[PDB]
Amino acid sequence: MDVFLMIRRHKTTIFTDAKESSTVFELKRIVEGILKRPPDEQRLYKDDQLLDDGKTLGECGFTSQTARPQAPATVGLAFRADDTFEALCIEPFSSPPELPDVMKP
Amino acid sequence: MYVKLISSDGHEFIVKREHALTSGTIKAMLNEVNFREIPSHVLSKVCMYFTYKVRYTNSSTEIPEFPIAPEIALELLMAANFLDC
Amino acid sequence: NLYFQSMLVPDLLQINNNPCYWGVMDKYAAEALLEGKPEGTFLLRDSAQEDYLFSVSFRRYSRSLHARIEQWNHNFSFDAHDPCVFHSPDITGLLEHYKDPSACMFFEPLLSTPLIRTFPFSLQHICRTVICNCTTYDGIDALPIPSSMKLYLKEYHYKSKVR
Ligand SMILES: [Cl-]
Ligand code: NA
């Protein structure tokens, strides 16, 4: 069972997938190959809840119904700055404009 | 393995190369690609399409809807047309 | 009328969410998909004829048969000008009527087992279906897009000669 994710930090988003049975730590290994920071130097978040390295993604609530290719689940990410971790911060996307009147109910 | 597509507002999207090659414009112009006319609320959505396109190509199942909100539909139409996908 | 009004297929997003619909495909390609298949196996596709948007291709009497969808007075049917023949304000309802095999007559299509599309459409097409669903044909002209794109959004229309 593949689950589809957006890992987000500042103005960065990673589109990737992993098995439901893979661990949060294994996801940190995916991120290490891309962003070049080891697992011990990352916090992964579901909303504002820091996740457990040893839990599976399905156990954290990432599933078929929840993390779909066309509507992936967001995982937050924060790096360690020296001894301390930086605050989880995700810069939002731009806003669409008002709907044209011909396109309204 | 991965490529970076940067939107007009500076958002950086890391997606798999195989999925980005779903766009003919991107396939033709290939690590990094800058899109000075496509903003992040549209590019994020395009990325989601690339995953949908690749995963439901030769589908093992009935294919679900790609949800698009009317509010981004026109920009998404023009970016899809510009990206050739 | 001695003129016609262009009108968006009202049902267009439903049709495109219906997995029995395969988009641009000719009758030879339908015949390849349907080859050998049991009575009532069917698909909806675009008709390659200029005056019709859609056709069904289906199986009956061990033959791959086709039926163009006609319109008149804002209804769709397989004979638009014979009002004895069943019609619907929707493409979806016209398929739904011919779903039940023991209630299909020999001269009527039999559309009981849909053949399911195995690839996704283009992102451009998917946006179109959503935009068309919010707007009307005349509304397309007031959109802030080039007219090449207005041309594209207007593709799935029918010609209304009635009022
Ligand atoms: Cl199509
Ligand atoms: Na046609």
Structural domain boundaries in chain C:
1-163
Rounded to the nearest angstrom, the gap between the alpha carbon of residue B73 and the centroid of all alpha carbons in its chain is: 14
Resolution in units of Å: 2.5
Domain boundaries B1-85, CATH class:
alpha beta
Q: Which CATH number fits domain C1-163: 1.10.10.10, 3.40.1160.10, 3.40.50.300, 3.30.505.10?
A: 3.30.505.10
Distance C26 CA to ligand 2 centre (A): 10
Cα–Cα nearest to C119, from C42, C53, C24, C35:
C24
Residues of B numbered 30-69 whose beta carbons fall under 8 angstroms of chain A's beta carbons: which are they? Answer: 39-42, 44, 47-52, 54-56, 64-67, 69
Q: Which ligand is nearest to the CA of C49?
A: 2
Which domains, and CATH codes, for chain A? 1-105 (3.10.20.90)
Strands (E), chain C: 5-8, 21-24, 41-46, 54-60, 63-68, 70-72, 75-77, 113-114, 157-160
Kindly list the domain boundaries of chain B, sorted by start residue.
1-85
Query: How determined?
Result: X-ray
* DSSP letters spanning C66-98: EEE-EEETTEEES-TT-TTS--BSSHHHHHHHT
CA distance A61 to A85: 24
| Residue in C19, C119, C128 nearest the CB of B77 | C128
Q: Which residues of C touch A97 (CB under 8 A)?
A: none
Query: Does the CB of A103 have a partner CB in chain C at under 8 Å?
Result: yes
CA angle A77, A83, A84 (to 5 degrees): 45
